[PDB]
Short mmCIF file of C-alpha atoms and ligand atoms in Angstrom, two decimals:
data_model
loop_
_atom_site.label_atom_id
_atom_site.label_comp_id
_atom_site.label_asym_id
_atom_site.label_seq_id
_atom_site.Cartn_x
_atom_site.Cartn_y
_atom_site.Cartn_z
CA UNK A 1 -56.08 34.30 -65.62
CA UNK A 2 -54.19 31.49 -64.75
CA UNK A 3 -53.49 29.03 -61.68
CA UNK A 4 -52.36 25.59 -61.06
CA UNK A 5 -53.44 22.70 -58.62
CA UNK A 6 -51.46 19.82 -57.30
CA UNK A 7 -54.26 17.19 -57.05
CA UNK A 8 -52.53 15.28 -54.60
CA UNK A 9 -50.44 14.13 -51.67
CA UNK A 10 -47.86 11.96 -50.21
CA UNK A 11 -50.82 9.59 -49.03
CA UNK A 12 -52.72 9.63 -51.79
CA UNK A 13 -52.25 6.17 -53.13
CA UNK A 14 -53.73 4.81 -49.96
CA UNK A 15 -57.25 5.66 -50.68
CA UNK A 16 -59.31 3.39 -50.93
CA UNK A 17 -61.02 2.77 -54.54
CA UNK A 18 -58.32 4.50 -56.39
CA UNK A 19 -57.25 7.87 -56.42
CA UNK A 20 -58.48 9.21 -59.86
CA UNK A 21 -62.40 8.20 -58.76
CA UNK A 22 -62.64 10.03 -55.63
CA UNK A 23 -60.99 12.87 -57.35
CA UNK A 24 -63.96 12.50 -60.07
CA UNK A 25 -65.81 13.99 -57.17
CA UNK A 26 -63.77 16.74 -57.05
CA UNK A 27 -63.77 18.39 -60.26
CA UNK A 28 -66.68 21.04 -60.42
CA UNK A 29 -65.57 22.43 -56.93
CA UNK A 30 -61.86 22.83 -58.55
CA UNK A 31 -62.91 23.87 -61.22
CA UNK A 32 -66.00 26.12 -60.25
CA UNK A 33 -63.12 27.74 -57.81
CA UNK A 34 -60.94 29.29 -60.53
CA UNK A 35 -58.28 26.91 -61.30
CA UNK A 36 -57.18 25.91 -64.73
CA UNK A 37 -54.06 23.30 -64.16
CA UNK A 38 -54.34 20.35 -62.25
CA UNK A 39 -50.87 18.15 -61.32
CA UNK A 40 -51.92 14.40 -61.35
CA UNK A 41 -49.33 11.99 -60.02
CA UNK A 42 -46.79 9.51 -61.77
CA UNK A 43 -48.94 8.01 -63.77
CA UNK A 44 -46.69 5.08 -64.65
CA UNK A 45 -45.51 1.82 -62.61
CA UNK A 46 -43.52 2.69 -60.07
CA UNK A 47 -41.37 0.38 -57.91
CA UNK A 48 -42.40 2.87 -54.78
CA UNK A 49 -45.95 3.70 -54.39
CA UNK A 50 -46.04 7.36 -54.86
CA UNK A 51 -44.30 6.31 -58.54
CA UNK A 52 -41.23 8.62 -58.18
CA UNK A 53 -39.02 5.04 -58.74
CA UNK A 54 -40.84 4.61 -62.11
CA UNK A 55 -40.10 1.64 -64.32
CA UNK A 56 -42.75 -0.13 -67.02
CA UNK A 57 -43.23 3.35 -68.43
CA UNK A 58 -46.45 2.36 -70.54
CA UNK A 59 -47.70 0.46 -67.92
CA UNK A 60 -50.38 2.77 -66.57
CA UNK A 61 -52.54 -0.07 -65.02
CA UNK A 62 -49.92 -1.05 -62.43
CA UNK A 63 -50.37 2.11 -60.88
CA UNK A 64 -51.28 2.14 -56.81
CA UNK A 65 -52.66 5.86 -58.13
CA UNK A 66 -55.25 3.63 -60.48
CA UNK A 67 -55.29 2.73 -64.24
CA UNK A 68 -55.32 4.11 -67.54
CA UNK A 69 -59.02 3.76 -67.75
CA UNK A 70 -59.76 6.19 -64.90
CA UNK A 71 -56.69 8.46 -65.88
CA UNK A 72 -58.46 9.30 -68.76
CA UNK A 73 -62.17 9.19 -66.99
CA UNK A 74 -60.99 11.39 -64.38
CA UNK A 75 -58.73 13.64 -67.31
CA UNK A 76 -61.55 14.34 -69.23
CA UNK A 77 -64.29 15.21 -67.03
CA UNK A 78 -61.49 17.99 -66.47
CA UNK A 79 -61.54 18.70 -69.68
CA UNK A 80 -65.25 18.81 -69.41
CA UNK A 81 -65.45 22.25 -67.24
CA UNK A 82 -62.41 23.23 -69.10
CA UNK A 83 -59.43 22.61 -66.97
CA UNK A 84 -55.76 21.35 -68.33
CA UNK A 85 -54.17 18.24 -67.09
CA UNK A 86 -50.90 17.94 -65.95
CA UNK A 87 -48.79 14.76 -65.60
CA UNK A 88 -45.72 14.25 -63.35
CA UNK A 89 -42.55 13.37 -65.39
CA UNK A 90 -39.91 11.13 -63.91
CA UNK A 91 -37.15 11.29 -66.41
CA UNK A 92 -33.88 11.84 -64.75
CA UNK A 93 -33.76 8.09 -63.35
CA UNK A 94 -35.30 5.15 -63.51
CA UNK A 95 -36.01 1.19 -62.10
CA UNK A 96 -35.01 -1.27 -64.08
CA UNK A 97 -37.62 -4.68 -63.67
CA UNK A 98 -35.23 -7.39 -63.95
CA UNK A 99 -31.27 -8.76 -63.60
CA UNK A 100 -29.14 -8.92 -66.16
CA UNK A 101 -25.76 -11.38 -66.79
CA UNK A 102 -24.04 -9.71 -64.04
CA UNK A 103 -26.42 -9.86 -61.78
CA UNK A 104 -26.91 -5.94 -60.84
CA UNK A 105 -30.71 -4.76 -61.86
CA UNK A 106 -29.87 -2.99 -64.90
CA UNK A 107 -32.64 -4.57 -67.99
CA UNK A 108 -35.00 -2.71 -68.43
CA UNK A 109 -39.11 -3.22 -69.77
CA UNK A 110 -40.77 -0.39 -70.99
CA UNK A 111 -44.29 -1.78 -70.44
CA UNK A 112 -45.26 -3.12 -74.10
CA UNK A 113 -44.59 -5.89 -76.86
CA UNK A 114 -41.67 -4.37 -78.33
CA UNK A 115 -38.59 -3.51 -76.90
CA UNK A 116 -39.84 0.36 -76.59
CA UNK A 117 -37.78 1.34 -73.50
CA UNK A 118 -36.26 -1.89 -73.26
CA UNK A 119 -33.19 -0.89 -72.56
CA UNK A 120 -29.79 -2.14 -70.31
CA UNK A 121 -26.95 -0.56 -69.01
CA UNK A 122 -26.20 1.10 -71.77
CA UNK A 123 -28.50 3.70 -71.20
CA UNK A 124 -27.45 4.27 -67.60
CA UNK A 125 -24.87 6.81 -67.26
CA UNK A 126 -21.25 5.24 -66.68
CA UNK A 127 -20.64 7.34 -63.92
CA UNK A 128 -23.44 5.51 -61.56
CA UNK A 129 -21.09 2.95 -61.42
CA UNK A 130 -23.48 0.77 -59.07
CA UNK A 131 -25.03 0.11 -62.67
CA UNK A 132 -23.66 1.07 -65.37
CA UNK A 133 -21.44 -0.89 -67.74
CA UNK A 134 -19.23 2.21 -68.29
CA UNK A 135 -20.51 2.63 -72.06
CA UNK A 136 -22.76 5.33 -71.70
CA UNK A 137 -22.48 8.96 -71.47
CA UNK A 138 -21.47 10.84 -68.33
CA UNK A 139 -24.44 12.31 -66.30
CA UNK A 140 -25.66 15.53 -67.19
CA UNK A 141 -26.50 16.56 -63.80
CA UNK A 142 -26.98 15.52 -60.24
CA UNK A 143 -27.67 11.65 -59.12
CA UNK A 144 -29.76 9.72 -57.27
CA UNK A 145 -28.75 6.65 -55.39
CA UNK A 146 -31.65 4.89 -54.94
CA UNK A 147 -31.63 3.69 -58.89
CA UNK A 148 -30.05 3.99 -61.92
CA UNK A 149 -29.51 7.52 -63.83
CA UNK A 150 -30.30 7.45 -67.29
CA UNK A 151 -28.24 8.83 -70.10
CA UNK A 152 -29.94 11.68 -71.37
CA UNK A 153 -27.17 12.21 -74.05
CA UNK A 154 -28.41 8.64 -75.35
CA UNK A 155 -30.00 8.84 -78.82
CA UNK A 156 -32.13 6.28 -78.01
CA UNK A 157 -33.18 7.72 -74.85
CA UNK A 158 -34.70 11.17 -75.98
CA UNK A 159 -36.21 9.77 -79.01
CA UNK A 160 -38.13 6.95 -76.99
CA UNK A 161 -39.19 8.63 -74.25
CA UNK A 162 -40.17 11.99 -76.55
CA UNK A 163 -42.32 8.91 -78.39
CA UNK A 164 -43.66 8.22 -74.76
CA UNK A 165 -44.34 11.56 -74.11
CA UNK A 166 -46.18 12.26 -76.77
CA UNK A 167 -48.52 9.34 -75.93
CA UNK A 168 -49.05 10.66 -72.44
CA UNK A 169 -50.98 13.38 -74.65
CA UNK A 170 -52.35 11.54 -77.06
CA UNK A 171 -54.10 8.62 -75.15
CA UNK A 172 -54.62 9.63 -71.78
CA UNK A 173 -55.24 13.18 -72.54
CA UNK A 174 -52.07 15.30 -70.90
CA UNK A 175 -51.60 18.92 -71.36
CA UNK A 176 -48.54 20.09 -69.82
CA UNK A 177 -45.36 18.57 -67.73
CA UNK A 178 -44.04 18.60 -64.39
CA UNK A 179 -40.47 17.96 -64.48
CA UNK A 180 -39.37 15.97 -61.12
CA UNK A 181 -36.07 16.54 -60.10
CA UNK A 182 -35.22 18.67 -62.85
CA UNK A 183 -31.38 18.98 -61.01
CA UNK A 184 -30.92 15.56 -62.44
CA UNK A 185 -30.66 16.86 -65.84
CA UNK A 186 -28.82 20.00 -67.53
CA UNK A 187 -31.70 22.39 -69.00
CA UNK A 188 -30.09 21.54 -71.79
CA UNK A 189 -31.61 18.57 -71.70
CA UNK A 190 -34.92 19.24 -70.23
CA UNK A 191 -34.85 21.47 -73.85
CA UNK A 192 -34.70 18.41 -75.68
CA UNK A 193 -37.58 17.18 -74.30
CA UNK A 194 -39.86 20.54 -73.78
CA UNK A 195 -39.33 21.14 -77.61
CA UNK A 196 -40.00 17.70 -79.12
CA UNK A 197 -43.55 17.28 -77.04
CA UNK A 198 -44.65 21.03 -76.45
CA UNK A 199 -46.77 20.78 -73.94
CA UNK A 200 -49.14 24.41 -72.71
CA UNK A 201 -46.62 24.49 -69.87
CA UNK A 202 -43.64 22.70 -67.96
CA UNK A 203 -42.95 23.58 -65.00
CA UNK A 204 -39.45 22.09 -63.42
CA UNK A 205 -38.24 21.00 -60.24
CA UNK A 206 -35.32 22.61 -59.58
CA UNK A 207 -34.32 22.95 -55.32
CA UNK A 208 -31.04 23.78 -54.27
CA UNK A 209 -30.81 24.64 -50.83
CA UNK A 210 -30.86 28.08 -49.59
CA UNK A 211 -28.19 30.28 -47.96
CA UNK A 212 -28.78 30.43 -44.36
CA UNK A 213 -27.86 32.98 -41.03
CA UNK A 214 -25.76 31.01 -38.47
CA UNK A 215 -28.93 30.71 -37.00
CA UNK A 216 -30.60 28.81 -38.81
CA UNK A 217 -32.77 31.16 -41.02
CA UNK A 218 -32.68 32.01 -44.45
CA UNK A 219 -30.21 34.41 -45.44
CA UNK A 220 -32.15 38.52 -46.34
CA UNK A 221 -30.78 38.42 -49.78
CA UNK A 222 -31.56 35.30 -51.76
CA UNK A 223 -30.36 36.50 -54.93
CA UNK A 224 -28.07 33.84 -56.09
CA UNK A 225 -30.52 31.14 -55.04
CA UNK A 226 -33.00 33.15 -57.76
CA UNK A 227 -30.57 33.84 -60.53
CA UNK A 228 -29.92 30.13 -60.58
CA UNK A 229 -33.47 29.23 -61.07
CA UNK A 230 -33.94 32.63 -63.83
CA UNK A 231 -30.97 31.02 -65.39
CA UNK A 232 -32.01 27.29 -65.57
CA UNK A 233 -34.96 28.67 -67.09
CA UNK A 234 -32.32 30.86 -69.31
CA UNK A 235 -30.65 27.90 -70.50
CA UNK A 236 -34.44 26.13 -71.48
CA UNK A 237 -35.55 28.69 -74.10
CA UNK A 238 -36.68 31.11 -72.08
CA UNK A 239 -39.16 33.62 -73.65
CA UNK A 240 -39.75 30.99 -76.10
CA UNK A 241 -39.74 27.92 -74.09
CA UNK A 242 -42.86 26.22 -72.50
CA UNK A 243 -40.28 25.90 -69.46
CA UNK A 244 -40.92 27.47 -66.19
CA UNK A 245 -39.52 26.91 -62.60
CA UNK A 246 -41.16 26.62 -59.49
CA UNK A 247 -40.34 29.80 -57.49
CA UNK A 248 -38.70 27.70 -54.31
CA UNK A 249 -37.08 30.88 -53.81
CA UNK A 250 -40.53 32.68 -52.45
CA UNK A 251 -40.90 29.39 -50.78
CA UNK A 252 -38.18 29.69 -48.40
CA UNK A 253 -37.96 33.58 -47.67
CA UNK A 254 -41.45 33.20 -47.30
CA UNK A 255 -41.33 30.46 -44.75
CA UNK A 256 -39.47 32.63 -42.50
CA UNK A 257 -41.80 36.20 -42.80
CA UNK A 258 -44.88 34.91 -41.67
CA UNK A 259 -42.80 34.70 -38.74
CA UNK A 260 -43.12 38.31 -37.91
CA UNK A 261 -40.46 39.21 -40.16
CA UNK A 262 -42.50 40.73 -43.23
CA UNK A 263 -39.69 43.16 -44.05
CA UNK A 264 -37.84 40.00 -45.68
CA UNK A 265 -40.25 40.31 -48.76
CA UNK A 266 -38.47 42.97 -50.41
CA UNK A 267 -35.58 43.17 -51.94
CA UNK A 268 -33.05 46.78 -52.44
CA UNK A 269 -34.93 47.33 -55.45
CA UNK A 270 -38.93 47.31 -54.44
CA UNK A 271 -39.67 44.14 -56.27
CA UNK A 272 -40.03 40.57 -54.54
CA UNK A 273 -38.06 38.98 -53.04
CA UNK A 274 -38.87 35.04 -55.05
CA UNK A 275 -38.11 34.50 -58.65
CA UNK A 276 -41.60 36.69 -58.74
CA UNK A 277 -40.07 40.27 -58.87
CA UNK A 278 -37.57 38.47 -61.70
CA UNK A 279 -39.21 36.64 -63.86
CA UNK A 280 -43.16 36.89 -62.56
CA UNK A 281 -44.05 34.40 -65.63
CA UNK A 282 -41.65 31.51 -65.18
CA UNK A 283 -42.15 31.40 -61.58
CA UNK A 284 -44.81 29.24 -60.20
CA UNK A 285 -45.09 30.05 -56.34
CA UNK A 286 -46.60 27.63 -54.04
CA UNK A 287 -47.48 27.19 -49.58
CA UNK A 288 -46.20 23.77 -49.56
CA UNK A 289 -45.95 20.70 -51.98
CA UNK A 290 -46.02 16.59 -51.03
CA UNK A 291 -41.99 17.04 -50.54
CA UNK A 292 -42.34 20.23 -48.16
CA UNK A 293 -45.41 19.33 -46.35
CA UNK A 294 -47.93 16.88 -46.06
CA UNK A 295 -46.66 13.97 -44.18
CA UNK A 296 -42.95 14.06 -45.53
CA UNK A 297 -42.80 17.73 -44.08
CA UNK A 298 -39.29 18.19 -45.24
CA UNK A 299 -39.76 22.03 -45.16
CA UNK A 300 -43.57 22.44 -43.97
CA UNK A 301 -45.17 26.10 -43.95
CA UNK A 302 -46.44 27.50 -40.57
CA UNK A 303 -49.51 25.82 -39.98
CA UNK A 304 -51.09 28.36 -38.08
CA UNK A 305 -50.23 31.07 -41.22
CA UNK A 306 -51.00 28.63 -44.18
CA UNK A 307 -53.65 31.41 -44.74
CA UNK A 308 -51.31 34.39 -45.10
CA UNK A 309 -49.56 32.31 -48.09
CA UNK A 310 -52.43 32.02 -50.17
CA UNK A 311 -53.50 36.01 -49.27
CA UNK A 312 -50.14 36.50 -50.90
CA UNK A 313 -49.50 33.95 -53.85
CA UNK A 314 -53.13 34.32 -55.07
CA UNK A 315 -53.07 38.66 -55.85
CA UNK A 316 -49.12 38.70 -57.03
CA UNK A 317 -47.23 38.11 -59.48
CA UNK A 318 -46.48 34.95 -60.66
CA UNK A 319 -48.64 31.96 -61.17
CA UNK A 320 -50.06 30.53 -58.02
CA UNK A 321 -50.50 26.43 -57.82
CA UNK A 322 -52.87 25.43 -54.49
CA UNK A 323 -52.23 22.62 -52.53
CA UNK A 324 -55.07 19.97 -52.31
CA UNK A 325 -54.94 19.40 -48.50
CA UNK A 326 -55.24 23.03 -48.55
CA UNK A 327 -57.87 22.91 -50.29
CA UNK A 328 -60.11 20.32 -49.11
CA UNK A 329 -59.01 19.13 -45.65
CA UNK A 330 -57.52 22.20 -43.87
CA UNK A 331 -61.37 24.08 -43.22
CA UNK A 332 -60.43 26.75 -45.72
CA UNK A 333 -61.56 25.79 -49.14
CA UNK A 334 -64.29 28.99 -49.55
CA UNK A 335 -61.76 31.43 -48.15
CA UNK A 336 -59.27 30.31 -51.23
CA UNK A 337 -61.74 30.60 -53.97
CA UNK A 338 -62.54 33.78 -53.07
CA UNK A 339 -59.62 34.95 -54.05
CA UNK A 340 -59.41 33.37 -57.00
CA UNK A 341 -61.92 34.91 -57.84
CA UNK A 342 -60.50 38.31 -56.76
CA UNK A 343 -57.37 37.37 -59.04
CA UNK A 344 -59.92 37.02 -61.32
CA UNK A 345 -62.67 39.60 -60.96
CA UNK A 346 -59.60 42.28 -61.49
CA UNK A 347 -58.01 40.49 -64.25
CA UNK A 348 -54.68 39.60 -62.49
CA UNK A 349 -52.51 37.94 -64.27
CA UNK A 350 -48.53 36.33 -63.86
CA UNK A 351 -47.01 39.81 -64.72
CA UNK A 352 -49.43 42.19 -63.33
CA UNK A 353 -47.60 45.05 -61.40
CA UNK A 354 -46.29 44.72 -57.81
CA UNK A 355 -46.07 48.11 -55.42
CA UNK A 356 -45.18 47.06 -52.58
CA UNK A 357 -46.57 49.83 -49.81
CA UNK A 358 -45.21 48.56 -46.34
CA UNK A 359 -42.67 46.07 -45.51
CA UNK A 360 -42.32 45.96 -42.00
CA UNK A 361 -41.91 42.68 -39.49
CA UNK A 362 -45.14 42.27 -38.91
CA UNK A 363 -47.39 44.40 -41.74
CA UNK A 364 -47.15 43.59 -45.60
CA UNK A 365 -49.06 45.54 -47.33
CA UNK A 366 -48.72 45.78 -51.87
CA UNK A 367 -50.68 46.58 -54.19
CA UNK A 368 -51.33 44.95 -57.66
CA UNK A 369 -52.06 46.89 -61.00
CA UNK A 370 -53.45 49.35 -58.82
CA UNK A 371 -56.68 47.44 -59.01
CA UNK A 372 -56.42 45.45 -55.80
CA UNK A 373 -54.42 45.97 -52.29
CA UNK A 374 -53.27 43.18 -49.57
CA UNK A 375 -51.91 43.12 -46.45
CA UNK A 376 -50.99 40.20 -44.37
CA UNK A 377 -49.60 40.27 -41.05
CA UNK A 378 -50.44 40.74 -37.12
CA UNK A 379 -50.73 44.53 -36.57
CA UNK A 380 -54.88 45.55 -36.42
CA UNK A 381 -54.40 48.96 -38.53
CA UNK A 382 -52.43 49.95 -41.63
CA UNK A 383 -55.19 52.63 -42.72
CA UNK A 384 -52.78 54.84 -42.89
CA UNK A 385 -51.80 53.52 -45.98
CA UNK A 386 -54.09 52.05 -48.02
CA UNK A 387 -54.60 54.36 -51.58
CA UNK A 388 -58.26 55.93 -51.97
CA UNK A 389 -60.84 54.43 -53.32
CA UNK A 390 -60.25 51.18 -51.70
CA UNK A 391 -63.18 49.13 -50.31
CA UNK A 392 -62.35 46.32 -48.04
CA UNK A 393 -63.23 42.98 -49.41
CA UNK A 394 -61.95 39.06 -48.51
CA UNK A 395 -60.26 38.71 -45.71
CA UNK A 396 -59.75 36.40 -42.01
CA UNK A 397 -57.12 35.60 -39.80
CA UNK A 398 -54.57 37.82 -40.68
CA UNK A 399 -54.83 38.92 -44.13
CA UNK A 400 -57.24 41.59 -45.66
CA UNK A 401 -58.03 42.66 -49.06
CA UNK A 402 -59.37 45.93 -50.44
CA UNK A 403 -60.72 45.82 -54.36
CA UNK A 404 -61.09 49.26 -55.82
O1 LIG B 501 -37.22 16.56 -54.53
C1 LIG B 501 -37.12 16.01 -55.83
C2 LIG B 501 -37.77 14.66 -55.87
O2 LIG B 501 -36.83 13.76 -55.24
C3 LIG B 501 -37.27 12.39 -55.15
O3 LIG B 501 -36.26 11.65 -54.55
C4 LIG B 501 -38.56 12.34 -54.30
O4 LIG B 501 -39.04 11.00 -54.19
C5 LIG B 501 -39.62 13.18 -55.00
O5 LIG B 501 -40.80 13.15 -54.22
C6 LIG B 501 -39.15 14.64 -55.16
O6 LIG B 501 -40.11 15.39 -55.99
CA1 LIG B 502 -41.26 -4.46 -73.94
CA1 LIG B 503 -28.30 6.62 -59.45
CA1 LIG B 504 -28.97 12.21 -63.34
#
């Protein structure tokens, strides 16, 4: 058993009181539900509210989230009914909190005393020229304008921010990572960093876009989107790495199925189509995130089939993450846990076996270890194929399951 929770949203740092302490009040129901992973926020001061323009690193208190008190208060109750924490690292760039002889933003304060993160141009990339000071290394991988890139290749760098890491763990409590905009960075890199702070699990933000029809819609065969996120994850350690990739490849084939199109979730060979029929256990699927729904909606799932998703990324392969709206403000948080709990009752795990046993437009029906069967789509009977010994079980608008 294993599944992951993103405890949050765009809007989250509007609530009033803090985030962490109304989330205190949502522990037992997480955790009473099946999950084992929850994905808290950037914890650190962030120029932006949300904290993905991150700054005064060890300054937790600054945080619109909440402070370092209630991090931990809210990480440990958690803890308490046995659930990992997860914290969202921001590595690839970062703000710098004052001006320097020149005049460009480029002197850094890592949030303490010392001079811990206190860094200047030199650790900005000399290619981000709208920064730099053209001493540094050359970026690794991809930019962001909106602030400076830091130089990964940077002695400095991966030593104090492995040091910062590792206090993440050790103070607050953290578990695992969430790499944010792990394109920013070559694996290599990311390596450097898994390796030096091994957390239970990091999973990586890697989203290149996907090949699409004339028309607008994804491409059938999304294999070179996939083998670039098998191979990132190639690069990382694989096998041996705590590295794994969210599977944005089931993400956007299966943003365009629901639409009557179920035959898209299966590829030539009878696996699936995500990096789930690749790699089932580097491949953490997902319905939507705070980047592709919520109220940025930059690639937002069919509302009226955010049901279907879960019917399918909660019995297959791969390790399913729920989204919190989802969970608590979309009317469906019993009809999620249930199946959880299926996951769970049959012992389901990131590389149980997929058998697909209908593909078409509008019926998907598979079965997993041969223990449990689902079927999502709009057409009222599949009987027909459905092995024996199958009682019906969960199910609602659109999506049925049969346990043995
Ligand atoms: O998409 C990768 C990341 O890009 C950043 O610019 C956004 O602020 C983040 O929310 C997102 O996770
Ligand atoms: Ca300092
Ligand atoms: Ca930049
Ligand atoms: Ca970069």
């Amino acid at each position: 058993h294993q599944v992951l929770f993103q405890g949050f949203n765009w809007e989250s740092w509007k609530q009033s009181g803090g985030w962490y302490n109304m989330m205190m009040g949502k522990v037992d129901d997480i955790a009473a539900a099946g999950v084992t992973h929850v994905w808290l926020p950037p914890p650190s001061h962030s120029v932006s509210n949300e904290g993905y323009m991150p700054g005064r690193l060890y300054d937790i208190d600054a945080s619109k989230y909440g402070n370092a008190a209630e991090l931990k208060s809210l990480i440990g109750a958690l803890h308490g009914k046995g659930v990992q924490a997860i914290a969202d690292i921001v590595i690839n760039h970062r703000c710098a909190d004052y001006k320097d002889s020149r005049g460009i933003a480029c002197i850094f304060e890592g949030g303490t005393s010392d001079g811990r993160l206190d860094w200047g141009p030199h650790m900005i990339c000399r290619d981000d020229t709208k920064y730099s000071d053209g001493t540094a290394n050359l970026d690794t991988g991809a930019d962001f304008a909106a602030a400076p890139d830091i130089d990964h290749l940077n002695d400095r760098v991966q030593r104090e921010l492995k040091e910062w890491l590792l206090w993440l763990k050790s103070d607050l409590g953290f578990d695992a990572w969430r790499l944010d905009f792990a394109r920013g960075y070559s694996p290599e890199m990311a390596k450097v960093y898994i390796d030096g702070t091994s957390p239970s699990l990091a999973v990586a933000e890697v989203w290149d876009n996907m090949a699409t029809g004339g028309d607008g819609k994804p491409n059938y065969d999304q294999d070179a989107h996939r083998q670039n996120l098998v191979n990132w994850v190639d690069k990382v350690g694989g096998a041996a790495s705590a590295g794994m990739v969210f599977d944005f490849t089931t993400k956007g084939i299966l943003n365009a199925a629901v639409e009557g199109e179920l035959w898209r979730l299966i590829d030539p060979q009878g696996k699936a189509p995500g990096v789930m029929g690749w790699w089932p256990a580097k491949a953490v699927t997902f319905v939507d995130n705070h980047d592709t729904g919520s109220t940025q909606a930059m690639w937002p799932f069919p509302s009226d089939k955010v049901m279907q998703g879960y019917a399918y990324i909660l019995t297959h392969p791969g390790i399913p993450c729920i989204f919190y709206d989802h969970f608590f403000n979309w009317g469906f948080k019993d009809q999620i846990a249930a199946l959880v709990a299926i996951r769970k009752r049959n012992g389901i795990t990131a590389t149980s076996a997929l058998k697909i046993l209908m593909h078409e437009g509008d019926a998907y029906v598979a079965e997993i270890d041969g223990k449990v069967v689902v079927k999502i789509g709009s057409r009222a009977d599949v009987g027909a194929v459905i092995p024996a010994g199958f009682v019906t079980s969960a199910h609602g608008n659109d999506y049925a399951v049969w346990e043995k």
